[PDB]
Design a binder for this molecule. Structure first.
Ligand code: ZN
Lengths: 432, 76, 520
């Protein structure tokens, strides 16, 4: 059926009570089979943390497991994403991953989803008990973070526990990593700690064109500027970071520029990283973070112990270091805090002003927002960047002001961004 | 005041700070000592992730208290 | 050939080509293919460890296949050694797998000198007896050993390398070797060429601070900004020099940098501690390239160094015209180059006095030693015999940590208590559901017998005594997978001598998700 001793290393934790147990815990023989048969876990991403996570959840008594990943197997994966072989290059990570696991671990039951997370909606995500991430971009984490907050159901002010889906997020970057255990509408959420992310180096176009200094400066130019100017692989044809002839071409024009400026260091390997915005990765780290992550998944699902409070950062460069703390849930959160935020603009402020606030803020960092409001009992699109037809007809009004475009007071605006799937609200305060 | 601040590598360094100094300046001390740009610095005192415009008092930082340089990663 | 530089790109951006070679040519030995073992391997094979040998005299049990990702049901029975090898083999074809069905104890009798072939020995889930005998055999043999253990949600890992030197420590953040305070001839000469403007805002901040630094050196005869108050007034001295309240952001950059540029020339403590080391001072014909580069460095500081290590040669990026930054950049690389030459010259004299050809140490070693002169690190580990010896035990350490009843060093004590219980019982605590009953008592009997044997006045909540029984010598996969990644990186740290390894003992609590390093 399922063999003698298979789940011993797990049983001990579900059958025997204990000191550091969790309050709602209950020693029992059935626990295991209940865990094996009904706990549905969703793993997001199958690329390092992904694979690592599947192995760890499977060998921990999890059967019903779903994986989502839009990527295709590339060779530069084989040094850390062990579930794929060179004979898989080209196939869906999601599929090969599930394929591999269901075969290595007997009755495992991984269901793959060759989809991007934004392809599904609440309906699909309510389906799961616990969700674990091993993504590779901030935007995604923010999107899946928002999704889970939509799931919450507030009993007129009061939040219902059963509508909460625990979200375990992990991240890696060289010899550093970090795990996070989130609980929508309770624990600090991804948005709550959005400022823990380091800054990204953004080369001012002025020093990219007018005065290069580093090889990173010569590459960025031949990519962000020279390429559009003189279409290398036909007109209109985009820059494919994964096509050797493209990179081998930029590597060229870059040596030209670098040489013209007496800049040493332009290697082919550097043209790689600068273009693909590459992050150094090893297996060791992913194994660590994914491991932590699974442990917490096991805890939440079984109450065998008390879940990590909020965070954990790891580091290998110098010996071994891991700091654990409990992040504060910002009380004014564009995402998990319930009451709409409060903007402060002088009635004279133009639209493009309320817009730059969103985009350029620190607690918001929205990508390409869209503002709308109830203009005539009905609600109109003040401005929206997503489309272009709804963009043209709206940009002009990007110059008008608060009251100069019916913007009434004692009212709130609606914000939509590629960041989160939910709509965030802002209550405008004319205090000029 | 004589406060401590464990870096990302566990290395703990001390600082010259009066309850009046902004979080911003506390970061300015670490850099001077370690080289960690205040720009990529994320300090945390008891779950609170210090805003670099508020003062060391705003967080109840009392001499022997310990700060923590933490971080968050994008890859995975 | 070129196909490898493709599947390893991601790790090549960390330890480089050289790191890889070093790795690619090492032969690591693993002692038990249990989850912990199989996972560490998993992480060494993937990156491309030269070859590996898995020693083990056990037969896969039901539980062995239910928690190890490298043993299917199909292999229950077949020797756990041979079994594991096959599945691990599949991860990389560039890796050479090998196995030995003989137990670890059995080889220590029959052929003790067997491990003299390995670059590193990774041992997992070993009980005290064998854990000790091995360490002793390996310590003498000069063999780097990494013992790991997975007990319940507790991860244990003890490294044992008598002396692990390292040049390329890879510091995460570090103070720039700018030398504004102790400029060299050519550097001073550079500033001197700048003058009072068309190119103002496109002048490197370093040149800025420099110029106004000289203006302060005058008015303030000799003195240099040293007090936060003085540094502030310096910042203004720079503000008042803003050419045209129009556009001068770099001046603003200088102003900001003034917080670090005025103090960046002094020999780091760790470096000094190496200079004053008996191995650096008294060199012999046995002395290693490291220690000779060590002295060569010291001899350099004394003579042409003038109190400081060789100029690093590098500088950060800074808003500034092209040609200029480059020239400034040049000034540092040429200087860096000159200093490297000097150090080498000492290395040579040094080598000859020992009776060795100057070409004994490569030019590419010297190039490296100099750009990392400030980050050298040396890690010596106390033997396992010491840590265990009654007189050599590190009591202070244990007791200072124990102030907190939950300081992970408890887990170390409980682990010692378990191993003790092992001997005095032939079996581990609470492996069966009925054994948990009384075993909770018999355990403390040992936790005390242990503490007593070393006179340790520390308080261990009885809450742990339970837990360690609840565990039942269980090897939870997620906990094993943790040591897997953490351990494996340490091994690579060793094999490549390229990062700083942790000291002595590392403990991870899966229960709280926290870890701490010790020096036992
Ligand atoms: Zn939030």
């Amino acid at each position: 059926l399922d063999w003698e001793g298979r789940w011993n290393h797990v049983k001990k934790f579900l059958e025997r009570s204990g000191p550091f147990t969790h309050p709602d815990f209950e020693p029992s023989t059935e626990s295991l089979q209940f865990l094996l048969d009904t706990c549905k876990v969703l793993v997001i991403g199958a690329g390092g943390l992904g694979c690592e996570l599947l192995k760890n959840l499977a060998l921990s008594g999890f059967r019903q497991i779903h994986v989502i990943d839009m990527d295709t197997i590339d060779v530069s994966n084989l040094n850390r994403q062990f579930l794929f072989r060179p004979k898989d290059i080209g196939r869906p990570k999601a599929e090969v991953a599930a394929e591999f696991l269901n075969d290595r671990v007997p009755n495992c039951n991984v269901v793959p989803h060759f989809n991007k997370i934004q392809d599904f909606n609440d309906t699909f995500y309510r389906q799961f008990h616990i969700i674990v991430c091993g993504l590779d971009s901030i935007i995604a984490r923010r999107w899946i973070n928002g999704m889970l907050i939509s799931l919450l159901n507030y009993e007129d002010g009061v939040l219902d526990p059963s509508s909460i889906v625990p979200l375990i997020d992990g991240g890696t970057e060289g010899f550093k990593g970090n795990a996070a255990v989130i609980l929508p509408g309770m624990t600090a959420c991804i948005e709550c700690t959005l400022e823990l992310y380091p800054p990204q180096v953004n080369f001012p176009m002025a020093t990219i064109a007018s005065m290069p200094r580093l090889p990173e400066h010569c590459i960025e130019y031949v990519r962000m500027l020279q390429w559009p100017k003189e279409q290398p692989f036909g007109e209109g044809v985009p820059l494919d970071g994964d096509d050797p002839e493209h990179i081998q071409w930029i590597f060229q024009k870059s040596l030209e520029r670098a040489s013209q400026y007496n800049i040493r260091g332009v290697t082919y390997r550097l043209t790689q990283g600068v273009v693909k915005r590459i992050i150094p990765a090893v297996a060791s780290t992913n194994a660590v973070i994914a491991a932590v992550c699974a442990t917490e998944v096991f805890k939440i699902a079984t109450s065998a112990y008390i879940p990590l409070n909020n965070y954990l950062v790891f580091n290998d460069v110098d010996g071994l270091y891991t700091y654990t703390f409990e992040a504060e849930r910002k009380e004014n959160c564009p995402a998990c805090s319930q009451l709409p935020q409060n903007i402060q603009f002088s009635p004279s402020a133009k639209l493009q002003e309320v817009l730059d606030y969103l985009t350029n803020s620190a607690s918001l960092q929205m990508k390409s927002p869209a503002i709308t409001a109830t203009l005539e009992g009905k609600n109109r699109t003040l401005y929206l960047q997503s489309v272009t037809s709804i963009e043209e007809r709206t940009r002009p009004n990007l110059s008008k002001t608060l009251k100069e475009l019916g913007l009434v007071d004692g009212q709130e605006l609606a914000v939509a961004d590629v960041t989160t799937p939910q709509t965030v609200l802002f209550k405008l305060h004319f205090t000029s | 005041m004589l406060i401590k601040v464990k870096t990302l590598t566990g290395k703990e360094i001390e600082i010259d700070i009066e309850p009046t100094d902004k979080v911003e300046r506390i970061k300015e001390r670490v850099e001077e000592k370690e080289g960690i740009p205040p720009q990529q610095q994320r300090l945390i005192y008891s779950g609170k992730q210090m805003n670099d415009e508020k003062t060391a008092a705003d967080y109840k930082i009392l001499g022997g208290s310990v700060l923590h340089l933490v971080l968050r990663l994008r890859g995975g | 050939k070129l196909l490898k530089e493709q599947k390893y790109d991601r790790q090549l951006r960390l330890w480089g080509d050289h790191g890889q070679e070093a790795l690619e040519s090492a032969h690591v030995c693993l002692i038990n293919a249990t989850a912990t073992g199989t996972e560490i391997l998993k992480n060494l094979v993937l990156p491309g460890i030269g070859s590996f040998t898995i020693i083990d005299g056990n037969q896969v049990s039901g539980e062995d296949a239910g928690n190890n990702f490298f043993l299917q049901r199909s292999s229950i029975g077949k020797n756990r050694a041979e079994a594991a090898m096959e599945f691990l083999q599949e991860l990389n074809s560039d890796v050479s797998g090998s196995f030995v069905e003989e137990s670890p104890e059995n080889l220590l009798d029959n052929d003790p000198s067997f491990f003299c072939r390995f670059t590193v020995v990774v041992a997992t889930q070993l009980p005290e007896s064998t854990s000790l005998r091995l360490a002793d055999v390996l310590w003498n043999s000069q063999i780097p050993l990494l013992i790991c253990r997975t007990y319940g949600l507790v991860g244990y890992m003890r490294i044992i390398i008598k002396e692990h030197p390292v040049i390329e420590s890879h510091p995460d953040n570090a103070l720039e070797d700018l030398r504004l305070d102790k400029p060299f001839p050519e550097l001073r000469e550079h500033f001197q060429s700048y003058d009072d403007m068309e190119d103002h805002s496109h002048t490197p901040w370093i040149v800025i601070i420099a110029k106004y630094l000289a203006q302060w050196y005058s008015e303030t005869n000799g003195r240099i900004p040293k007090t936060y108050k003085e540094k502030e007034d310096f910042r203004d001295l720079i503000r008042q020099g803003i050419l045209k309240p129009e556009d001068e952001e770099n001046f603003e950059e200088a102003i900001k940098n003034v917080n670090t540029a005025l103090n960046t020339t002094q020999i780091p403590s760790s470096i000094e501690d190496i200079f004053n080391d008996d191995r650096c001072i008294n060199i012999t014909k046995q002395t290693p390239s490291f220690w000779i580069l060590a002295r060569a460095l010291k001899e350099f500081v004394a003579k042409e160094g003038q109190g400081n290590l060789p100029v690093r040669g590098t500088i950060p990026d800074m808003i500034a015209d092209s040609g200029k930054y480059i020239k400034l950049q040049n000034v540092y690389r040429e200087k860096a180059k000159k200093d490297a030459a000097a150090v080498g010259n000492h290395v040579a004299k040094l080598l000859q006095s020992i009776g060795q050809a100057p070409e004994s140490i490569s030019e590419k070693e010297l190039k490296l030693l100099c750009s990392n002169s400030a980050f050298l690190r040396v890690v010596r580990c106390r033997s396992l015999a010491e840590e265990y010896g009654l007189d050599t035990i590190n009591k202070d350490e244990i007791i200072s940590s124990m102030d907190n009843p939950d300081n992970e060093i408890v887990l170390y004590l409980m682990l010692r208590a378990v191993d003790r219980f092992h001997k005095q019982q032939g079996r581990y605590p609470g492996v069966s559901n009925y054994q948990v009953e009384e075993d909770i008592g018999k355990l403390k009997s040992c936790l005390t017998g242990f503490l007593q044997e070393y006179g340790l006045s520390v308080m261990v909540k009885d809450d742990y005594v339970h837990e360690f029984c609840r565990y039942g010598a269980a090897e939870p996969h997620t906990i094993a997978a943790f040591l897997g990644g953490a351990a494996a990186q340490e091994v690579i740290k060793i094999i490549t001598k390229q990062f700083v390894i942790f000291n002595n003992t590392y403990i991870y609590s899966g229960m709280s998700q926290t870890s701490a390093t010790f020096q036992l």
